[PDB]
Design a binder for this molecule. Structure first.
Ligand SMILES: CCCCCN1[C@H](CC(=O)NC)[C@H](O)[C@H](O)[C@H]1CO
Ligand SMILES: [Cl-]
Length: 677
C-alpha cells in the first residue's frame, strides 16, 4: 500500500527486475539526498553504460528534459516511471526528487518493481509535526528517529516547541542554549536537512515578555543564535498565557519586525509561523477583536496556527471557513491529537480520523501535536502524513494498519490488538473522545444486558469475549519481548503489563460466569481479587507523573464489561449461597465507611481521595505522617473534622488544613488527604 497514496497512479501487470546492470543519468546534478537513497537501493549492482537507463533529476536538468510535460508543476511534485526500457525519477524541485525516491523505495519488492507511472504532489503545502506538548520533551535519539520517519512519509515540517524546554519558554527563552544542547540541535538541523524536513525552531515568550526594546532585542538575538546553529525556519507561540503578552497589536508588530529585520534580511529563511493566544474558536472572545486584529496587521506571508473549534478538535469545513474569514489567510492547522498531556494515564494509539478530507485548499499547513511517547506517536504521525499529502484518498483504517505494519513488522497483529483497545482518552475536561474496541462492543453489550436481566446470553458473544482475552494475552506477552523496536516497547511496557492483567482478569471472570461449583467459583473469585491488587500496584508504581499518574488500558468497553460482569456474578453467588462476597472491582488498601457514600477511594501518589461524583470516615491501612487535608463541594446534609491513630482518641483539625506531620490513620467528618512517604 503506497503511503502516502500518490495523486495519480497507473499500474500495468508487469514485473521488472531491478537491473543487474544500470546506467545512471543525472546522478551528478539531482538532489544529493535523492541520489544517496538510490545508490543504497542499487547496492551490489553494476553501474556501467552497458545497462538499463536510470534517469534522475529536477525539472530543468538535462537528465530529465524529455519528461518536462509529465512533471507536475507543483512544489514537491514529481514524475516517476518504470518499464522494461527505463526508470525515470524526476522532481519538479529537489524535494520532489527525494519524494520520488521515497515512493520508488516502497515499489521495490524482492528486487523487482511493478511497471508503473505516477504523477504526484501534495495537497497541503506544509505537513508534519509540532512537538508542542507539556511533559518530558522527546529525547535526542527519539528526535533523530522522528526526522528519518518524516522524510520517508513526505512530511516536510518539524516545529520544535516542547512546552517544558526552559530555553523555549519563560523565563529562559532569553538565554542561548548551552553548549551540549546547542550541539544536539545543530545535529537535529543537519539530519532534518538530509531528510528534506524544515526544522522550525519556536519560541514561547509571552508569559513574561515586556513590550520594550530590551525583550525585542533578546528575542532577535536568540533567533540569531539559532540561525548560527543552522535553523532556517522560526515560530513565535503565544498559546496558554495571560497578561500583556496576549495583546494582538503588539504580537503582530513583533512578528512583522522579525519578518522585516530578520526573516527578509537573511538570504534563506523559509517558514515564519505564529501561534495566537486565541488559538481555537471556543477560546475566541467575540466581545473583543483579537483575531481580526492579527489578520489585518500580521504580514501576509506569516502563518497563523489554529486547533479548530475547540482546544481538542477535528477540522471541519465550516470551522476552517470561520477562522479563515477572520485571519484573512488559510489557517495553519495545529491538530491536538495524539497529544495525551491532559490524559497522561492513557495511550492514544487509535486511527486518525474526523478531519474533513475536501478542505486541503483551505489550509496553509497541517501538523500534529503528538504524545510525549515518540515511537508510539508514529501511528498517528504516519496517518496524518498520508492524510495531509492526499486527503481525497485518505483511508483511515488501512493507513492505521499500514502504520502499525511499518513501525513493527515482526508483530503487527499483536500491535493492532494492543492499539485497538488503547485508543480512547477516557473522561476529560475537553470532552474529546475516540472510539475503542469497536469490533467487540456489540457482543460485550448484548452479553452484559442479558446476563444482568437473567436471560440466556448468546454463546457466540461469550466466545468472542473469550477469544479477545486470549488474543490480548498473546499480544501482551509478544510485545514485551519484541526487540525490533526497543524504544517503542520501553514506552508502552507499563500499559502492556496492565493490558495483560486486564485480559487475565477477563478470563477468570468468564469462568466465574460459567462456573458450576462453589469451590471452583471461589478459587476464581480469589484470583480476580489478587489480579485487581496487581493492577493497583502497576497503577501506583508506573508512569507516576504529577497530573494523571498511573496506567489505564482498555477503558472504554472492556474494563467496564469485566467490572460489571464481576459485580453482577458476585451478586448472584451471594443471593444463591446467602453469602457476602465483596463485589468491589478496584483494589483499595484503605477504607471509607461513611454517611452521605458509595464513592470509591483513590490513591494518587501520596494522596488519598474520595472519588468526586456528580450529585464521613476514612481509615488508612497504616499510620502515616499527615501533610494536609483539602475538601470541596456537592452536598445537601447540614460538619466537623478530626484525626486519629487508633480511631479512639481524636484531635480536631481547623479549616484547607495543615497537619504538621502528625500521625494519621483515621479522618472523620460526620475530599483529599495528603500524607508523607
Ligand atoms: C486549557 C488549555 C489546554 C492546553 C492545550 N494544548 C496546549 C496549547 C495548545 O493547544 N497550543 C495550540 C499545549 O500545546 C498542549 O499540548 C495542548 C493539549 O493539552
Ligand atoms: Cl461485537
Amino acid at each position: 500500500s503506497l503511503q502516502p497514496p500518490p495523486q495519480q497512479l497507473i499500474v500495468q501487470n508487469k514485473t521488472i527486475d531491478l537491473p543487474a546492470v544500470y546506467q545512471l543519468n543525472g546522478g551528478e546534478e539531482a538532489n544529493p539526498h535523492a541520489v544517496k537513497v538510490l545508490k543504497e537501493l542499487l547496492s551490489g549492482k553494476q553501474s556501467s553504460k552497458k545497462g538499463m537507463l536510470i534517469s534522475i533529476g529536477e525539472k530543468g536538468d538535462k537528465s530529465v528534459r524529455k519528461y518536462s510535460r509529465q512533471i507536475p508543476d507543483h512544489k514537491e511534485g514529481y514524475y516517476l516511471s518504470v518499464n522494461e526500457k527505463e526508470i525515470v525519477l524526476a522532481g519538479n524541485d529537489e524535494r520532489g526528487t527525494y519524494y520520488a525516491l521515497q515512493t520508488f523505495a516502497q515499489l521495490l519488492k524482492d528486487g523487482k518493481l511493478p511497471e508503473v507511472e505516477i504523477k504526484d504532489y501534495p495537497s497541503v503545502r506544509y505537513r508534519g509535526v509540532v512537538e508542542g506538548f507539556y511533559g518530558t520533551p522527546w529525547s535526542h535519539q527519539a528526535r533523530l528517529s522522528q526526522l528519518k520517519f518524516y522524510g520517508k512519509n513526505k512530511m516536510n515540517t518539524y516545529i520544535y516547541g516542547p512546552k517544558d524546554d526552559p530555553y523555549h519558554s519563560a523565563p529562559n527563552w532569553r538565554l542561548p542554549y548551552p553548549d551540549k544542547e546547542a550541539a544536539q540541535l545543530q545535529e537535529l538541523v543537519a539530519v532534518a536537512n538530509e531528510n528534506e524536513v524544515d526544522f522550525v525552531w519556536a519560541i514561547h515568550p509571552g508569559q513574561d515578555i515586556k513590550w520594550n526594546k530590551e525583550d525585542r532585542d533578546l528575542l532577535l538575538a536568540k533567533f540569531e543564535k539559532m540561525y548560527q546553529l543552522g535553523v532556517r525556519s522560526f515560530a513565535v507561540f503565544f498559546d496558554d498565557i495571560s497578561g500583556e503578552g496576549t495583546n494582538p497589536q503588539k504580537q503582530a508588530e513583533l512578528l512583522n519586525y522579525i519578518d522585516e529585520k530578520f526573516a527578509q534580511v537573511k538570504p534563506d529563511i523559509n517558514q515564519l509561523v505564529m501561534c495566537p493566544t486565541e488559538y481555537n474558536k471556543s477560546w475566541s472572545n467575540p466581545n473583543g477583536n483579537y483575531l481580526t486584529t492579527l489578520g489585518d496587521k500580521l504580514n501576509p506571508s506569516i502563518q497563523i496556527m489554529w486547533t479548530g473549534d475547540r482546544v481538542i478538535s477535528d477540522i471541519t469545513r465550516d470551522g476552517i471557513s470561520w477562522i479563515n474569514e477572520r485571519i484573512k489567510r488559510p489557517a495553519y492547522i495545529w491538530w491536538n491529537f495524539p497529544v495525551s498531556d491532559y490524559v497522561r494515564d492513557h495511550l492514544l494509539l487509535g486511527p486518525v480520523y474526523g478531519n474533513d478530507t475536501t478542505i486541503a485548499k483551505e489550509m496553509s499547513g497541517f501538523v500534529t501535536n503528538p504524545m510525549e511517547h515518540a515511537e508510539s506517536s508514529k501511528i498517528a504521525i504516519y496517518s496524518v502524513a498520508s492524510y495531509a499529502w492526499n486527503p481525497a484518498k485518505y483511508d483511515t483504517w488501512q493507513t492505521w494498519k499500514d502504520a502499525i505494519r511499518t513501525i513493527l513488522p515482526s508483530a503487527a497483529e499483536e500491535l493492532e490488538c494492543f492499539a485497538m483497545h488503547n485508543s480512547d482518552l477516557g473522561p476529560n475536561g475537553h470532552g474529546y473522545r475516540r472510539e475503542e474496541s469497536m469490533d467487540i462492543q456489540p457482543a460485550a453489550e448484548r452479553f452484559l444486558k442479558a446476563f444482568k436481566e437473567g436471560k440466556n446470553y448468546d454463546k457466540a458473544d461469550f466466545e468472542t469475549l473469550q477469544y479477545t482475552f486470549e488474543r490480548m494475552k498473546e499480544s501482551a506477552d509478544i510485545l514485551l519481548m519484541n526487540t525490533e523496536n526497543k524504544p517503542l516497547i520501553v514506552e508502552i511496557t507499563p500499559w502492556v503489563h496492565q493490558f495483560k492483567l486486564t485480559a487475565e482478569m477477563g478470563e477468570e471472570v468468564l469462568k466465574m460466569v460459567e462456573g458450576r461449583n462453589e469451590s471452583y467459583f471461589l478459587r476464581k473469585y480469589n484470583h480476580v481479587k489478587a489480579l485487581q491488587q496487581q493492577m493497583f500496584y502497576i497503577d501506583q508504581t508506573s508512569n507516576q507523573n504529577p497530573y494523571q499518574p498511573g496506567v489505564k488500558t482498555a477503558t472504554r468497553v472492556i474494563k467496564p464489561l469485566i467490572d460489571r460482569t464481576f459485580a453482577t456474578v458476585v451478586k448472584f453467588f451471594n443471593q444463591k449461597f446467602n453469602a457476602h462476597l465483596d463485589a468491589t472491582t478496584d483494589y483499595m488498601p484503605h477504607k471509607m465507611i461513611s454517611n452521605v457514600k458509595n464513592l470509591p477511594l483513590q490513591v494518587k501518589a501520596n494522596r488519598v481521595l474520595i472519588s468526586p461524583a456528580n450529585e464521613v470516615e476514612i481509615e488508612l491501612d497504616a499510620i502515616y505522617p499527615g501533610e494536609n487535608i483539602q475538601i470541596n463541594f456537592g452536598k445537601d446534609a447540614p460538619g466537623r473534622l478530626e484525626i486519629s491513630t487508633d480511631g479512639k482518641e481524636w484531635k480536631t483539625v481547623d479549616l484547607s488544613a495543615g497537619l504538621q506531620k502528625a500521625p494519621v490513620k483515621f479522618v472523620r467528618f460526620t475530599f483529599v488527604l495528603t500524607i508523607e512517604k
